[PDB]
RNA sequence: GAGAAAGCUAUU
RNA sequence: AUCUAUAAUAGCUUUCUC
């Protein structure tokens, strides 16, 4: 369950995924599938972001091994997913408002300074174009959203922003991760949809239960009997 | 109340206050009232509404 | 408006400051040197 | 004239007048009859169909959308950490800090329901570690007494904490 | 201005029967529900720290824009401006005893309008909506 | 040492 | 037809034991 994600993903990435799920108000234990999806989404977002960097003349260049922190001070792609809802909304509205761009009605996943556009990075399994057009249905071109898939298919938007090196890096990493999970036989653990309807958890401990038991009117032993009497007795007459 | 008084009858008004209102009302009765009122609510909400009269029934 | 969020005040303020520094550097309100100092301090947190 | 017993949670002497003997004079009576209360409530429900369900649904939804800071909207509140009275926001903050000290973190979720869950779970804790106030006293020549407060870590047992949490502080109007 | 450019009629002494109705306290430019008004104010004054773009707030978009262009270089503290806008955009409706004049322009003078045994004819200034007429 | 609730008012 | 909606602080009144 969590062992594969802990061994493969970093501590910060999994912590961000857990915080996002907690903000989304879903139990972390009974649905590992959402946890894995969030982890892989934010991880591939980081992989994409760690490719391009900004110069002083407004061009997007590439870094490699053997570079200091003075040359690596500001990024190219600003990653929004994994941040809290309030922080993410603040970042998106700030970029849109100071770049003279109307803010979309849905939270984005990345922002690019070279084209100054918001991107909704997604990963699917089926037809890439089908998911691409399904995402295109809502707003059309408010975000140059990008669609990836595990079968090495992808529906890149018109605003081309990634070259061959980074795309191949991401695809090879995805293939390696899929192979590593498949040899461990985790695919059936995640594909199978197990969503029972969940409510609000409020359980009474021992002390409060004992207080409630001794708090019933005279003539009842415990609170269960009193509650049953309240529900199932006609007090008429 | 004036309009609905039966014809040929009489109507009385009692200006009343209840003595020892707070010293006689019992939190166990309030526990019963909350259990009757939240009859068709989920279990967790019923427990939540039962907590307060219980804490008042053991107050110090 | 009462702010909402389950994250720390320090991280919220840090991200807000980082975005403000980025935006006012990209608009030409601050130079290269003070932006370098600001990003260094933000990373030091 | 009700039923007198001893609480097995705190050891206090408890009196239960409900379902007790019916009064025989015009003195104040606390012996409410459960069946009569239920019948009055049933008549109320029959006269106003769906009233109780609508009220319960509205209350539950409001409780779902209720945050912890609502508790800050009160006047002087009894603070169990110092066994004194403090403003509502200060008392709430001291409670949250103490619950953090006792490995309870329901206030971090921000809703009222996790905070109440952490409260009733604190009722089960065998010990309670918190921050209390100590007053250093000085003999000031002038002689008078000078008080300087400081926060320290204090500890109470399960029954003592339960009695403090159930305590009402009384003053004069 | 409404008070100064106003005409006072005669005063009559006689029984006045007042009914307690929920009435608008002060006249308003664009009456909005407090949630929508709060979102609009948030858009006008704190666009960066605003949040999800609720659809209803876009309805007043033009108005929003206007206010922003009127507050580009205002050094007044933002919270005072927020409550100025809220006073301009949020209705305050209260239960009050009235007799025959429930428009907000008459509600603001309600105290001089009538008592239980007298009436004062008052002609407020400003321009009145056609719905009231 | 000066509570709860309701209504109303002022202010930010 | 005001029915919805309604941030916080402070004040005043009322009610809440003799
Ligand atoms: Mg009376
Ligand atoms: Mg009384």
Q: What DSSP line would sit under chain E, residue for residue?
A: -TTTT-EEEEEEES----EEEEEESS--SS-B-HHHHHHHHHHHH-STT--S--HHHHHTHHHHHHHHHHSSS--S-HHHHHHHHHHHHB--EEEEEESS--SHHHHTTHHHHB-SSEEEEEE--S---TTT-
E38 to chain C nearest CA, in Å? 9
* Distance, C-alpha D104 to centroid of its chain: 17
Q: How far apart are CA B40 and CA D54, in angstroms?
A: 10
CA of D47, C1' of G2: distance in angstroms: 28
Q: Count Cβ neighbours within 10 Å for each residue of B18-39 and write b for 16 or more, e otherwise.
A: eeeeeeeebbbbbbbbbbbbbe
DSSP D71: G
Q: Check if residue D85 sits with its Cβ under 7 angstroms from strand F.
A: yes
What are A87's two structure tokens?
């922080």
Establish if C1 touches chain E: CB-CB under 8 angstroms: yes
Residues less than 5 Å from ion ligand 1, measured at CB: B 17
Residues 6+ apart with CB under 8 A from C41: none
Where residue A116 falls (left for φ over 0; alpha for ψ -120 to 50; beta otherwise) is left
Asked if the structure places residue A196 within a domain, the reply is: no
CATH classification of the domain holding A49: 3.40.91.90
Identify the CA nearest to C21 among candidates C11, C35, C32: C35
| Resolution in angstrom units | 2.6
Residues 46-65 of E with CB under 8 A from C: 49
Asked if the structure places residue A206 within a domain, the reply is: no
Angle at which helices A32-49 and A164-183 cross, to 10°: 150
Q: How far apart are CA A182 and CA A191, in angstroms?
A: 12
Helix (H) and strand (E) counts in chain D: 5, 6
Beta strands E19-24; D3-6: pairing state: unpaired
Radius of gyration, alpha carbons of chain D: 22
Cβ distance A74 to A53 under 8 Å? yes
For A47, the domain range is 1-191
Angle at which helices B43-57 and D112-122 cross, to 10°: 50
Report helix, strand or coil for D64.
Answer: helix
Q: Check if residue D88 sits with its Cβ under 7 angstroms from strand F.
A: yes
Residues 6-45 of C with CB under 8 A from E: 16
Which residues on B lie below 8 Å from D65 (Cβ)?
A: none
Asked if the structure places residue A235 within a domain, the reply is: no
- Backbone torsions φ then ψ of A162, nearest 5 degrees: -115, 140
Beta strands A121-124; A146-149: pairing state: parallel
Strand partners for D53 = none
Strand partners for D86 = D77
Radius of gyration, alpha carbons of chain C: 12
CA of D14, C1' of F2: distance in angstroms: 29
CA of B20 to the centre of ligand 2 (A): 6
CA of B19 to the centre of ligand 1 (A): 11
Asked if the structure places residue A200 within a domain, the reply is: no
Neighbour subunits, E (≥3 Cβ pairs < 8 A): A, C
Cα angle, residue A236 at apex, residues B1 and A218 outer, rounded to 5°: 110
Asked if the structure places residue A228 within a domain, the reply is: no
Residue with tokens 């209803």: E56
DSSP A152: S
Q: How far apart are CA E70 and CA E74, in angstroms?
A: 8
Residues 6+ apart with CB under 8 A from E56: E36, E39
Cβ distance E23 to E104 under 8 Å? yes
Asked if the structure places residue A167 within a domain, the reply is: yes
Please name the residue of chain D whose CA is at the shortest distance from the CA of residue A203: D117
Identify the CA nearest to A64 among candidates A144, A169, A188, A155: A169
Asked if the structure places residue A204 within a domain, the reply is: no
Cβ distance D99 to D106 under 8 Å? yes
Establish if B55 touches chain A: CB-CB under 8 angstroms: yes
Question: Do A208 and B54 lie within an 8 Å CB cutoff?
Answer: yes
Asked if the structure places residue A222 within a domain, the reply is: no
B38 to chain D nearest CA, in Å? 6
Q: How far apart are CA C20 and CA C25, in angstroms?
A: 8
DSSP D149: E
Chain G nucleotides near the protein (CB, 7 A): 2-9, 15-18
Establish if A22 touches chain C: CB-CB under 8 angstroms: yes
For residue D18, give the nearest of A201, A208, A217 by CB distance: A217
Q: Check if residue E26 sits with its Cβ under 7 angstroms from strand F.
A: no
DSSP A217: P
CA of B13 to the centre of ligand 1 (A): 11
Q: How far apart are CA D31 and CA E44, in angstroms?
A: 61
Radius of gyration, alpha carbons of chain E: 19
CA of D69, C1' of G12: distance in angstroms: 26
For residue A200, give the nearest of B35, B39, B44 by CB distance: B44
Residue A117 to residues A50, A58, A76, Cα–Cα distance (Å): 18, 15, 12
Name the method of structure determination: cryo-EM
């Amino acid at each position: 369950m969590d062992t594969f994600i802990t061994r493969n993903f970093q501590t910060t990435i999994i912590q961000k995924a857990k915080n996002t799920m907690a903000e989304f108000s879903e139990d972390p234990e009974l649905q590992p599938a959402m946890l894995f999806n969030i982890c892989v989404h934010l991880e591939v977002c980081y992989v994409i972001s760690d490719m391009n960097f900004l110069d002083e003349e407004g061009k997007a260049y590439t870094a490699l091994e053997g570079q200091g922190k003075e040359q690596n001070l500001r990024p190219q792609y600003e990653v929004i997913e994994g941040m809290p809802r309030t922080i993410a909304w603040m970042v998106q509205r700030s970029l849109a408002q100071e770049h003279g761009i109307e803010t979309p009605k849905y939270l984005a996943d990345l922002f690019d300074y070279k084209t100054k556009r918001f991107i909704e990075v997604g990963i699917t399994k089926g037809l890439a174009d089908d998911y691409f057009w399904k995402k295109k249905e809502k707003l059309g071109n408010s975000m140059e959203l990008m669609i990836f898939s595990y079968n090495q298919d992808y529906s890149l938007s018109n605003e081309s922003s990634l070259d061959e090196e980074g795309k191949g890096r991401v695809l090879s990493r995805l293939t390696e991760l899929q192979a590593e999970l498949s040899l461990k036989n985790l695919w059936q653990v995640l594909i199978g949809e197990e969503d029972v309807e969940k409510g609000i958890d409020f359980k009474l401990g021992q002390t409060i239960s004992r207080l409630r038991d001794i708090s019933v009117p005279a003539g009842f032993s415990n609170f269960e009997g009193m509650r049953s009497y309240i529900d199932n007795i006609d007090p008429k007459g | 109340m004036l309009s609905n008084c039966p014809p040929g009858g009489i109507s009385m008004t009692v200006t009343g206050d209840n003595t020892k209102w707070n010293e006689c009302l019992n939190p166990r009765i309030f526990l019963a009232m909350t259990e009757r009122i939240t009859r068709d609510s989920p279990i967790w909400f019923r427990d939540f509404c039962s907590i307060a009269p219980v804490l008042f029934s053991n107050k110090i | 408006r009462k702010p909402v969020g389950q994250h720390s005040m320090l991280e919220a303020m840090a991200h807000r400051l980082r975005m403000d520094a980025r935006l006012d550097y990209e608009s030409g309100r601050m130079s290269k040197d003070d932006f370098e100092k600001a990003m260094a301090h933000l990373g030091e947190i | 004239k009700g039923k007198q017993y001893i609480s097995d949670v705190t050891g206090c002497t408890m009196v239960d007048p409900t379902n007790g003997p019916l009064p025989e004079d015009n003195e104040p009576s606390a012996y409410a009859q459960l069946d009569c209360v239920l019948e009055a409530l049933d008549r109320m429900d029959e006269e106003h169909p769906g009233l109780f369900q609508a009220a319960s649904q509205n209350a539950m939804e409001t409780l779902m959308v209720t945050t912890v800071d609502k508790l800050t909207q009160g006047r002087q509140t009894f603070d169990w950490t110092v066994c004194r009275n403090q403003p509502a926001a200060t008392a709430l903050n001291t409670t949250i800090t103490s619950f953090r000290l006792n490995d309870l973190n329901g206030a971090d979720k921000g809703g009222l329901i996790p905070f109440c869950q952490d409260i009733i779970d604190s009722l089960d804790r065998p010990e309670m570690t918190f921050f209390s106030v100590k007053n250093i006293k000085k003999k000031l020549p002038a002689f008078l007494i000078k008080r300087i407060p400081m926060k320290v870590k204090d500890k109470i047992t399960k029954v003592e904490y339960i009695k403090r949490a159930l305590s009402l502080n009384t003053m004069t109007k | 201005m409404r008070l100064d450019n106003a005409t006072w009629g005669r005063i009559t002494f006689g029984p006045v029967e007042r009914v307690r109705k929920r009435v608008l306290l002060n006249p308003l430019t664009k009456e909005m529900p407090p949630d929508e008004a709060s979102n609009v104010i948030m858009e006008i004054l704190f666009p960066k720290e605003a949040g999800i773009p609720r659809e209803s707030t876009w309805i007043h978009r033009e108005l929003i824009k206007e206010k922003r262009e009127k507050l580009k270089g205002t050094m007044i503290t933002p919270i005072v401006l927020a409550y100025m806008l809220e006073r301009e955009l949020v209705a305050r409706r209260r239960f009050l005893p009235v007799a025959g004049a429930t428009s907000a322009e008459f509600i603001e003078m309600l105290h001089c309008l009538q008592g239980e045994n007298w009436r004062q004819i008052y002609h407020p200034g400003g321009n009145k909506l056609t719905e009231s007429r």
